[PDB]
Amino acid sequence: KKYSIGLAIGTNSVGWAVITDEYKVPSKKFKVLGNTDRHSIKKNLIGALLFDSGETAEATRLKRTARRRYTRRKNRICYLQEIFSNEMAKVDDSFFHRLEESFLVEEDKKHERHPIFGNIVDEVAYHEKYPTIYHLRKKLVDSTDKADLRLIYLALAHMIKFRGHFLIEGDLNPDNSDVDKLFIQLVQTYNQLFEENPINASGVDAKAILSARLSKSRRLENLIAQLPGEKKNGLFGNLIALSLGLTPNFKSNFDLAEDAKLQLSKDTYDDDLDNLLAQIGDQYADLFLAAKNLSDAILLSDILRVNTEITKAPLSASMIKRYDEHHQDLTLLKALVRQQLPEKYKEIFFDQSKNGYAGYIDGGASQEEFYKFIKPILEKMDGTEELLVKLNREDLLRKQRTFDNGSIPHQIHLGELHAILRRQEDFYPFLKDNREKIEKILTFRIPYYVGPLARGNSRFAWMTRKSEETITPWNFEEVVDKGASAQSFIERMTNFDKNLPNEKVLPKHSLLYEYFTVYNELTKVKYVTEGMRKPAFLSGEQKKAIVDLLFKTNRKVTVKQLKEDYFKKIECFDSVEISGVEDRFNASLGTYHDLLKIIKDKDFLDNEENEDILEDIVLTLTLFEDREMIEERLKTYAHLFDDKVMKQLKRRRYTGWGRLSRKLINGIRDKQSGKTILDFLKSDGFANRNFMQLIHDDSLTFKEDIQKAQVGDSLHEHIANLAGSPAIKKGILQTVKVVDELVKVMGRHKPENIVIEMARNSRERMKRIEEGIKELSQILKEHPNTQLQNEKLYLYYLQNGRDMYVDQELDINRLSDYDVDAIVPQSFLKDDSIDNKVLTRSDKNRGKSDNVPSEEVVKKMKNYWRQLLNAKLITQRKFDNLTKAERLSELDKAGFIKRQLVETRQITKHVAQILDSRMNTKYDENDKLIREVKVITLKSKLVSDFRKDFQFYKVREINNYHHAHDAYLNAVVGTALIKKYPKLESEFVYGDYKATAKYFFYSNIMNFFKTEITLGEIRKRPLIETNGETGEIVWDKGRDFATVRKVLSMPQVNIVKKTEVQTGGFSKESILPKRNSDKLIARKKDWDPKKYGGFDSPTVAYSVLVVAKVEKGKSKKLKSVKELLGITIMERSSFEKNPIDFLEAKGYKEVKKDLIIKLPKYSLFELENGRKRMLASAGELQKGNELALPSKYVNFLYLASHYDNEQKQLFVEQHKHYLDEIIEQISEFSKRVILADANLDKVLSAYNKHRDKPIREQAENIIHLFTLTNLGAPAAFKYFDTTIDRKRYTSTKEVLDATLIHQSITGLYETRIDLSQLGG
DNA sequence: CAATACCAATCCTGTCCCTAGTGGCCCC
DNA sequence: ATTGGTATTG
Ligand SMILES: [K+]
Ligand SMILES: [K+]
Ligand SMILES: [K+]
Ligand SMILES: [K+]
Ligand SMILES: [K+]
Ligand SMILES: [K+]
Ligand SMILES: [K+]
Ligand SMILES: [K+]
Ligand SMILES: [K+]
Ligand SMILES: [K+]
Ligand SMILES: [K+]
Ligand SMILES: [K+]
Ligand SMILES: [K+]
Ligand SMILES: [K+]
Ligand SMILES: [Mg+2]
Ligand SMILES: [Mg+2]
């Protein structure tokens, strides 16, 4: 009675099977609970659990953070109103009331309906004088008269509520009055250097050219056009580009060896410019200085389109410009349409349904949709030239609140706000006293490193307070501990040392950590010369000399440097061979050289007395990102260095953390030697033990202390903390629960083996392509995100339109004639990603098809491939695989096959470890683990090839059985494999461990199933396959294949759709207009949706069976009812708080409490003739049955549809009649179970219509036909050209008298409840 | 109670931590 | 994308 378990783990399924030692699947009677006829039922021990995908937490986080922003924005407004309260009460005692109730209809308002002034005359006059808020803002900035306090409030509130971005540090003071003079000064500073070839700036309208509503590049070309004998990539062209906010590279201008890319807005610009000047000289400093100056005058030319000398509110003035031009152009456009085409006027100016001006102002038409609609009308008419110019510049009839306003920095709104306060504090003293408070309301932003301002009821918060009092924007620095909070921000996320779990890991860039890595790599180097009899380790003296002479003088140390600069120079070896390092050392002392460049004091860095200091410094530079806090924490060391060194130290930042703590690296000491780990790495006799040897050596104390330092998650908590998609982690937890249930089903006996198999954006594509092209091209100009989902076109755009194996251009319109080749051939590496694929004219040109692209191709194309790699168009892996010919060995191919068959993904190993640790808990007399259950892992290709070899074909579309069948085949193949070759356990069993030959072995490892094999030459194998030593039979080709065939043909498979309560958003999010419908849901308690609109379409968390009574007619007589009420996600807590009260408030009486059944989505019901339905909601049903199509039809559909061999084609043609039979099957299933008369008859007519089609296409569309009979939600499908739309089951009445089936996770344990016995 | 046809909030900036895959060193 | 909600048409 021994057995094994097969498992197929997916993101929406767990297939499972129990097999005996004869590869059979047992069947058992299981008790059936409930109130029906049936006491028990037969069940095969094979099935699959289906489930909806687990979701990431991202959408939840987006909602959460947006909620916090709405709360805090309301609070900004509340702070402002509180400052205004006393004096506003003297001016207008109900003003803020009128603002708060502005949303209410007149019936519900408690004050006069006109919010600003409370009477119609003043309200109309206000709007006449100030058509937009920006008119008022500009007036209050520029005017010197005392202003009404309510208008002052409205201006300040508009600025605070929509305050612009915080992407620019420091203060911003707009001034575009002398762009021409700054440009001339740049030209003068340039001509100062290049007297021989100066630029004549006379007549160049730089102000107009550089401030036009065009792209930065467009203006760059326009400007260079005006400078004769000057080219766009020249030095002055690059300086203009710099001033425009581009990123020019000054490498070619100065014949440099490295890149000199420069961007003014990058926070690294100062140090980059200092590096460049160190290369070329400080005489060029002024030049870039002048660039900065010009840049400061045109920085915001895009948003500030008005001269700054006329107004201190140029943003509001630019909005007013938008408004005025909109008005003038609207008058002109109306007149032109009235004249040249009157019949269209209405459609353009009245029809909200159309994308005219009506749809633009009143309908749902966007600015883009409106321009696309009206541009043909303009081109068709005469007198529309300037209108078309504005249209093509996205600047025609513009609104002021628009999608592109995100560019406005908060400093501009702050400038207008500060100016208004300065104007009006002369008249209202409270504005003088609170000016800085109001400014702070606008400017204050909670630092990202502080997080929510919680008080112990937020699982997201980490902020600590200095005093227990309410936090405001004004006391924030006094109440909140910014330092401790910024520390917690990082430390709550960083790892502890796995060896010393109470110690934090070191910063990745810690000097100590990098010393550790260098000495750890160095202590396993070995060397030989002529006079030496065997290879020798490096001694402590040698390693110290190597670190001092090489690692502390070069950032990277190459093997050639090791041989010449040390062995030759110091040891006088003319030749030496080195092992333990290839090409260059991996580790390096990067931080040592960074700090040397900064502080220019090698003796300070090499002085061990300073160790702690430097560690702390690096910790500070890793922990904190805010330069002010960096300065605060480094101030305690400012006495050791000067001002410029501290300036450079502040800008020196690191990110990243290591794997080990300082206490582990250089703290704990071996008791007898008194030496740290780093001490041993520096010098360990002639043993030269490295970190792994040191912490495992029983002759040292380290291992004992690690064990003393070591230290209870649940299964759910353990799985949740794994690295992996939430979708696959859901399947992992379900797999473990399935295994638990199956073990209970076998009387709590554990299996012999468990075999597990685990199955295997357009905006990102557009971003990659834009970045690569701008780093490179005008290919999007000549051939302008959805389209990028085409693979060959995607590869074309990623490759700059060139062949990758031949140095030639490729043609867009010829992509169908080209080839997509595997860089590493797919016969070795089953990688189908862009990282291993290439678009070439002909794959023949790769060279020989058995290896990496040939040496000739490498010699041809390595330079172009390096150019591609630099622009980040191919990865280092891709370039290395492309260029491997100059360096595929036989070991590579053997390993490629091995990895085709040996699973190495971390997540599958984690599933294997979970199962292995759950099954195997006992230890033997030697305290070794007792592995009662072997956990085998298989890659999909094994069972896939098994199916394709022995004609156990799968067609996923027929039904869901293929998951269960996959699990069964996994069990069979895995147990057979380790029975035949018991050595392979080392590769296939979790926890077990201690070129042409291995290639041949792993390539023919599965041949023992076959009777004849063709390698190549023919090989023949016996009928009965046995173990190499024990002699136990592992496979009988005369019986076991028939066993598999019988298992795969069994019609009763336990397919179970996991019932799930629905969670998440309450409803569709659209805020719909008002309507007479009880389906509208109020968005606020008192906002009756008949007056105000609201949501509809709530999601049902679960349905509820109610047996009760409802009042009928005017007399209100009671009438028994049985119906399904859907409890929405919003209603759920209220229903569960007290269900009888909830139901009675719904209009039910005398509800039978004990008969209330909670019915989550997918609840299973059986009706007549074995017909089954699943609950889709309280009002809709899904198909509940599986079509058990016989195996012969499945294999026919596979082979005929081309889902080669002659015997297969003869079988397809001899069994053509099968087509009809398959339709018959479908039909007899539908008429019994689907009950879609119209759709079925349309399908039958479509099949009789296309009988004269090729058999291949008829099978390819019969595959589509199974969407009619598939389990689950109805969906539309197509047979050839005819479309069958889904038939929906829009009533749930019939399941109220049907049989409810509660299923356990495997479906083996059932409780059946006849609902016809309830309420009659 | 029919089909049955339409509908579904969207973009964007910045700071940081973590694993894992790739294919190699060196180890338990 | 899918698929359950909704109004509409009957
Ligand atoms: K019974
Ligand atoms: K009223
Ligand atoms: K020129
Ligand atoms: K609109
Ligand atoms: K708007
Ligand atoms: K290396
Ligand atoms: K940092
Ligand atoms: K293993
Ligand atoms: K959930
Ligand atoms: K969900
Ligand atoms: K269940
Ligand atoms: K983000
Ligand atoms: K991220
Ligand atoms: K490794
Ligand atoms: Mg709220
Ligand atoms: Mg708005």
CSV table of N, CA and C in Angstrom, one decimal, chain A residues 41 43 48-49 741 1052-1059 1162-1166 1172-1174 1184 1271 1300-1312:
chain,number,residue,atom,x,y,z
A,41,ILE,N,-19.5,7.8,-2.5
A,41,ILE,CA,-19.2,8.0,-4.0
A,41,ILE,C,-17.8,7.5,-4.3
A,43,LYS,N,-14.2,7.8,-6.2
A,43,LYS,CA,-13.4,8.9,-6.6
A,43,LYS,C,-12.0,8.3,-7.0
A,48,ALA,N,-7.3,18.4,-10.0
A,48,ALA,CA,-6.6,19.7,-10.0
A,48,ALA,C,-7.5,20.8,-9.4
A,49,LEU,N,-6.8,21.6,-8.5
A,49,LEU,CA,-7.5,22.7,-7.9
A,49,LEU,C,-7.2,24.0,-8.8
A,741,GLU,N,-3.9,17.1,2.6
A,741,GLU,CA,-5.2,16.4,2.5
A,741,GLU,C,-5.0,15.0,1.9
A,1052,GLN,N,-13.6,10.6,-14.9
A,1052,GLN,CA,-13.9,11.2,-13.6
A,1052,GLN,C,-12.6,11.7,-13.0
A,1053,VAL,N,-12.4,13.0,-13.1
A,1053,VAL,CA,-11.2,13.7,-12.6
A,1053,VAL,C,-11.7,14.9,-11.7
A,1054,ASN,N,-11.1,15.0,-10.5
A,1054,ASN,CA,-11.6,15.9,-9.5
A,1054,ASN,C,-11.1,17.3,-9.8
A,1055,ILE,N,-11.8,18.0,-10.7
A,1055,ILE,CA,-11.5,19.4,-11.0
A,1055,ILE,C,-12.3,20.3,-10.1
A,1056,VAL,N,-11.6,21.1,-9.2
A,1056,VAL,CA,-12.3,21.9,-8.2
A,1056,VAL,C,-11.9,23.3,-8.4
A,1057,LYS,N,-12.9,24.2,-8.6
A,1057,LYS,CA,-12.7,25.6,-8.6
A,1057,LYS,C,-12.8,26.2,-7.2
A,1058,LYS,N,-11.7,26.6,-6.6
A,1058,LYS,CA,-11.7,27.1,-5.3
A,1058,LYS,C,-12.7,28.2,-5.1
A,1059,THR,N,-13.7,28.0,-4.2
A,1059,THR,CA,-14.6,29.1,-3.9
A,1059,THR,C,-13.9,30.2,-3.1
A,1162,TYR,N,-18.3,31.1,-7.1
A,1162,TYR,CA,-17.9,29.7,-7.7
A,1162,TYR,C,-18.6,28.6,-6.9
A,1163,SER,N,-19.5,28.9,-5.9
A,1163,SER,CA,-20.2,27.8,-5.3
A,1163,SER,C,-20.9,26.9,-6.3
A,1164,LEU,N,-20.8,25.6,-6.0
A,1164,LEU,CA,-21.1,24.6,-7.0
A,1164,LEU,C,-22.5,24.0,-6.7
A,1165,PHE,N,-23.3,23.9,-7.8
A,1165,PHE,CA,-24.6,23.4,-7.8
A,1165,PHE,C,-24.8,22.3,-8.9
A,1166,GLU,N,-25.5,21.2,-8.5
A,1166,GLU,CA,-25.9,20.2,-9.5
A,1166,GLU,C,-27.4,20.2,-9.6
A,1172,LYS,N,-24.2,21.0,-14.1
A,1172,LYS,CA,-23.6,21.8,-13.0
A,1172,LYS,C,-23.5,23.3,-13.3
A,1173,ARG,N,-23.7,24.1,-12.3
A,1173,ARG,CA,-23.5,25.5,-12.4
A,1173,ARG,C,-22.7,26.0,-11.3
A,1174,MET,N,-21.9,27.1,-11.5
A,1174,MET,CA,-21.1,27.8,-10.5
A,1174,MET,C,-21.7,29.2,-10.3
A,1184,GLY,N,-20.5,24.7,-15.1
A,1184,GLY,CA,-19.9,24.0,-14.0
A,1184,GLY,C,-19.4,22.6,-14.4
A,1271,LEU,N,-15.5,24.9,-18.8
A,1271,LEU,CA,-15.9,25.3,-17.5
A,1271,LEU,C,-15.6,26.8,-17.3
A,1300,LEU,N,-26.6,21.8,-3.6
A,1300,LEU,CA,-25.3,22.5,-3.3
A,1300,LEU,C,-24.3,21.5,-2.9
A,1301,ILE,N,-23.1,21.6,-3.5
A,1301,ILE,CA,-22.0,20.7,-3.3
A,1301,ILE,C,-20.9,21.5,-2.6
A,1302,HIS,N,-20.6,21.3,-1.3
A,1302,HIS,CA,-19.4,21.7,-0.7
A,1302,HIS,C,-18.3,20.7,-0.9
A,1303,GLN,N,-17.2,21.1,-1.4
A,1303,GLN,CA,-16.0,20.3,-1.7
A,1303,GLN,C,-14.8,20.6,-0.9
A,1304,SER,N,-14.1,19.6,-0.4
A,1304,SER,CA,-12.8,19.9,0.2
A,1304,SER,C,-11.8,20.3,-0.9
A,1305,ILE,N,-10.6,20.6,-0.5
A,1305,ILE,CA,-9.6,21.1,-1.4
A,1305,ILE,C,-9.3,20.2,-2.6
A,1306,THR,N,-9.3,18.9,-2.3
A,1306,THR,CA,-9.1,17.9,-3.4
A,1306,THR,C,-10.4,17.6,-4.1
A,1307,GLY,N,-11.6,18.0,-3.6
A,1307,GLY,CA,-12.9,17.5,-4.1
A,1307,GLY,C,-13.2,16.1,-3.7
A,1308,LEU,N,-12.4,15.4,-2.9
A,1308,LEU,CA,-12.6,14.0,-2.5
A,1308,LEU,C,-13.7,14.0,-1.4
A,1309,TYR,N,-13.7,14.9,-0.5
A,1309,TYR,CA,-14.7,15.0,0.6
A,1309,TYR,C,-15.8,16.0,0.2
A,1310,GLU,N,-17.1,15.5,0.1
A,1310,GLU,CA,-18.2,16.2,-0.3
A,1310,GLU,C,-19.3,16.3,0.8
A,1311,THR,N,-19.9,17.4,0.9
A,1311,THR,CA,-21.2,17.6,1.6
A,1311,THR,C,-22.2,18.1,0.6
A,1312,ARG,N,-23.3,17.3,0.4
A,1312,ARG,CA,-24.3,17.6,-0.5
A,1312,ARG,C,-25.6,18.0,0.2
